[PDB]
Every structure is written in structure tokens, then in C-alpha cells.
């Protein structure tokens, strides 16, 4: 298992859907990669939801975020592989945390609310 600590962690199918939204919003410029820009989106409050990586090491550097996500009441999930995550973000270098941000004019908004809803299902 990808660490005992990191929670929640989606399955292969929902991971596939979430990564699909990652690539899509990445094509719509509605995504912000990286832990620092994820943190910036959380502080600004424009973040729809946070994706993070399970296989990353060390895990703590991604474990600073869940506290901030629970503070701002924003959903977050853990895709298993940072290589697949950044690969979906469109960067060869593996990305650990990505953030789907808010756009009122976005065409994928409904997709973001559906995936976000399933994320809130996972959160517990």
C-alpha cells in the first residue's frame, strides 16, 4: 500500500476519471500544478479541489496540505502515482499535488462538480 498515513485514496476507475479532469482542466488552463501553487490556490480560495500523490516521498511535504484543505473546507483525493498525476498534468517531471480551480465560464464545470462530488463521497 502507498503509505499507511495518506487518506483518502481513490480506486483505479475514479483515479482515471479524476486524472481525466486533470488533463482537461489543464487544457483549459483551470489547473495549477505543484505544492506551492496548490497552496496558493487554497489560500486564495479559488480551488475547486486538490489532487495529491500517494507514491511521493517523503509523504509529509504533501501532508502539510490536508490540514489547509480541511481549514478551507475544500475536497481532496490521493491519486496513487505522482508520475501518472504529473503525466496527466502535462509535465514529464512527476508532479505531487495539483489543484483544480474555479471558473464560472468553464465548459467542464459540470464534470468538475461530479468528480468533486465523488471526492466528497470519499472524504469521510
Amino acid at each position: 500500500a502507498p503509505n499507511p498515513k495518506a487518506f483518502p485514496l481513490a480506486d483505479a476507475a475514479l483515479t482515471q476519471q479524476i486524472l481525466d479532469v486533470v488533463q482537461q482542466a489543464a487544457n483549459l488552463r483551470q489547473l495549477k500544478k505543484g505544492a506551492n501553487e496548490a497552496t496558493k490556490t487554497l489560500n486564495r480560495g479559488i480551488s475547486e479541489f486538490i489532487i495529491m500523490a500517494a507514491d511521493c516521498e517523503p509523504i509529509e511535504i504533501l501532508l502539510h496540505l490536508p490540514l489547509l484543505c480541511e481549514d478551507k473546507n475544500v475536497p481532496y483525493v490521493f491519486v496513487p502515482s505522482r508520475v501518472a498525476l504529473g503525466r496527466a498534468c502535462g509535465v514529464s517531471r512527476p508532479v505531487i499535488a495539483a489543484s483544480i480551480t474555479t471558473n464560472d465560464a468553464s465548459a467542464i464545470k459540470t464534470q468538475i462538480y461530479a468528480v468533486k462530488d465523488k471526492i466528497e463521497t470519499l472524504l469521510i
Partner: protein, 115 residues
């Protein structure tokens, strides 16, 4: 014939009103005494079922009726447990590089071929 028919009709009509009255009476009984539409019948406990059930249990409950099980040991059984196609995206750099390589292969193939 018409008269007989008429009479029959009248009789039929008469018969319907009694049924309506009976239905009203049933509703009245239902307000203070069960409603099937609301499944209120399910609140009724069966003296026969529970009695023959407990006698079949011979006192106590179906859990401990075996009191046969082994206290001495503790079971740890049956750690009981779907392929999903992995879609690998990739960079605009590797899309441009990929298309450039493919069109380079086709281009050199047609060029050297026609040469």
C-alpha cells in the same frame, strides 16, 4: 325487456353505494384502529411466530443456543477480496515530438522510396 334491464341497472347502482360506505367505514376504523398504504400492518407482532421461535430456541437466544464452540482459540479466517484500462496522457512536447517523428518516418519513407 327494457324495464328488466333498467331494474338490473338500478340494482347495480344500489350495490355500489354500499361498497363505498364500507370503504368509508374502513377508513374510519383505520384512523383510530391499521393502514396498508402506509405499511402500518408491519407493526403487528406474531405471538405464534415468536412463541414457536423461542421454544425452538429452547430458552435464551439463537446466538447462544449452541451453549459446542471452542473457547480455547480465536479464528482469523477468509481475508476475502477489476481491471481498469490505464490511460496515459503526455506533454505537448511529446505530442509535438511524436508527430514530428512519425511524419519524419513517413516523409523519409516517401522520399527515399521515390528516390
Amino acid at each position: 325487456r327494457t324495464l328488466q334491464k333498467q331494474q338490473e341497472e338500478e340494482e347495480l347502482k344500489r350495490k355500489l353505494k354500499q361498497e363505498e360506505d364500507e370503504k368509508d367505514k374502513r377508513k374510519l376504523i383505520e384512523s383510530g384502529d391499521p393502514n396498508l398504504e402506509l405499511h402500518e400492518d408491519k407493526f403487528l407482532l406474531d405471538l405464534s411466530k415468536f412463541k414457536i421461535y423461542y421454544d425452538n430456541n429452547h430458552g435464551y437466544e439463537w446466538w447462544d443456543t449452541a451453549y459446542h464452540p471452542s473457547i480455547r482459540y480465536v479464528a482469523h479466517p477468509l481475508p476475502e477480496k477489476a481491471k481498469v484500462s490505464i490511460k496515459a496522457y503526455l506533454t505537448q512536447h511529446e505530442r509535438k515530438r511524436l508527430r514530428r517523428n512519425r511524419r519524419k518516418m513517413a516523409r523519409e519513407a516517401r522520399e527515399i522510396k521515390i528516390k
